[PDB]
Amino acid sequence: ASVYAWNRKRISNCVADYSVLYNSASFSTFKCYGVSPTKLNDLCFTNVYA
Protein backbone atom coordinates (compact mmCIF):
# COMPACT_ATOMS: atom_id res chain seq x y z
CA ALA A 1 0.00 0.00 0.00
CA SER A 2 0.86 3.69 -0.13
CA VAL A 3 2.04 5.58 2.95
CA TYR A 4 -1.00 7.86 3.31
CA ALA A 5 -3.21 4.73 3.28
CA TRP A 6 -0.91 2.24 5.02
CA ASN A 7 -2.37 -1.24 5.42
CA ARG A 8 -2.89 -2.36 9.02
CA LYS A 9 -2.85 -6.12 9.63
CA ARG A 10 -3.83 -7.45 13.05
CA ILE A 11 -1.68 -10.39 14.15
CA SER A 12 -3.52 -12.25 16.92
CA ASN A 13 -4.57 -15.71 18.16
CA CYS A 14 -1.46 -17.38 16.72
CA VAL A 15 2.14 -18.25 17.58
CA ALA A 16 4.72 -16.02 15.91
CA ASP A 17 8.17 -17.16 14.77
CA TYR A 18 10.23 -13.97 14.83
CA SER A 19 13.49 -15.91 14.38
CA VAL A 20 12.77 -16.49 10.68
CA LEU A 21 12.01 -12.78 10.25
CA TYR A 22 15.12 -11.73 12.19
CA ASN A 23 17.51 -14.20 10.53
CA SER A 24 16.46 -13.11 7.03
CA ALA A 25 19.28 -11.18 5.35
CA SER A 26 17.05 -9.42 2.81
CA PHE A 27 16.02 -6.75 5.35
CA SER A 28 18.26 -3.68 5.19
CA THR A 29 16.88 -2.18 8.43
CA PHE A 30 15.78 -3.98 11.61
CA LYS A 31 15.51 -1.40 14.40
CA CYS A 32 13.41 -1.88 17.54
CA TYR A 33 12.45 0.96 19.88
CA GLY A 34 10.60 -0.69 22.77
CA VAL A 35 11.74 -4.33 22.85
CA SER A 36 14.79 -6.45 22.05
CA PRO A 37 15.20 -8.37 18.77
CA THR A 38 16.64 -11.44 20.51
CA LYS A 39 13.78 -11.47 23.06
CA LEU A 40 10.93 -11.40 20.53
CA ASN A 41 10.75 -15.21 20.63
CA ASP A 42 10.50 -15.16 24.45
CA LEU A 43 7.99 -12.38 25.18
CA CYS A 44 4.22 -12.57 24.76
CA PHE A 45 1.87 -9.83 23.56
CA THR A 46 -1.89 -9.40 23.27
CA ASN A 47 -1.89 -8.42 19.59
CA VAL A 48 0.44 -7.06 16.91
CA TYR A 49 -0.37 -4.23 14.50
CA ALA A 50 1.53 -4.56 11.21
Binding site: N23, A25, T38
Partner: protein, 50 residues
Protein backbone atom coordinates in the same frame (compact mmCIF):
# COMPACT_ATOMS: atom_id res chain seq x y z
CA UNK B 1 28.38 17.29 20.85
CA UNK B 2 30.71 15.77 23.44
CA UNK B 3 31.31 12.24 22.15
CA UNK B 4 34.22 11.29 24.43
CA UNK B 5 32.00 9.31 26.83
CA UNK B 6 31.04 5.82 25.66
CA UNK B 7 28.82 3.03 26.97
CA UNK B 8 28.61 -0.65 26.07
CA UNK B 9 25.53 -0.93 23.87
CA UNK B 10 26.08 -4.61 23.03
CA UNK B 11 27.28 -7.57 25.09
CA UNK B 12 26.55 -11.29 25.20
CA UNK B 13 25.94 -11.54 28.96
CA UNK B 14 25.41 -9.42 32.05
CA UNK B 15 28.42 -8.42 34.12
CA UNK B 16 29.46 -9.54 37.56
CA UNK B 17 29.39 -6.90 40.31
CA UNK B 18 32.56 -4.75 40.11
CA UNK B 19 33.40 -6.24 36.71
CA UNK B 20 34.94 -4.06 33.99
CA UNK B 21 34.81 -4.81 30.26
CA UNK B 22 37.19 -2.78 28.09
CA UNK B 23 37.50 -5.40 25.33
CA UNK B 24 36.85 -3.88 21.90
CA UNK B 25 35.80 -7.11 20.20
CA UNK B 26 32.96 -7.16 17.70
CA UNK B 27 29.48 -8.38 18.59
CA UNK B 28 27.43 -10.89 16.59
CA UNK B 29 23.84 -9.62 16.63
CA UNK B 30 22.50 -12.12 14.07
CA UNK B 31 22.86 -15.70 12.88
CA UNK B 32 25.73 -14.83 10.53
CA UNK B 33 29.19 -14.86 12.18
CA UNK B 34 31.08 -11.58 11.94
CA UNK B 35 34.75 -12.78 12.05
CA UNK B 36 35.90 -9.47 13.52
CA UNK B 37 34.40 -7.51 10.61
CA UNK B 38 31.48 -5.08 10.71
CA UNK B 39 28.52 -5.76 8.45
CA UNK B 40 24.92 -6.88 8.61
CA UNK B 41 24.04 -7.35 12.31
CA UNK B 42 27.72 -6.77 13.23
CA UNK B 43 28.08 -3.72 15.47
CA UNK B 44 30.75 -2.08 17.59
CA UNK B 45 29.84 -2.52 21.28
CA UNK B 46 30.92 1.00 22.34
CA UNK B 47 28.71 3.92 21.28
CA UNK B 48 29.05 7.52 22.41
CA UNK B 49 26.61 9.78 24.21
CA UNK B 50 25.54 12.83 22.24
Amino acid sequence: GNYNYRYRLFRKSNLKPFERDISTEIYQAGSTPCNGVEGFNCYFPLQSYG
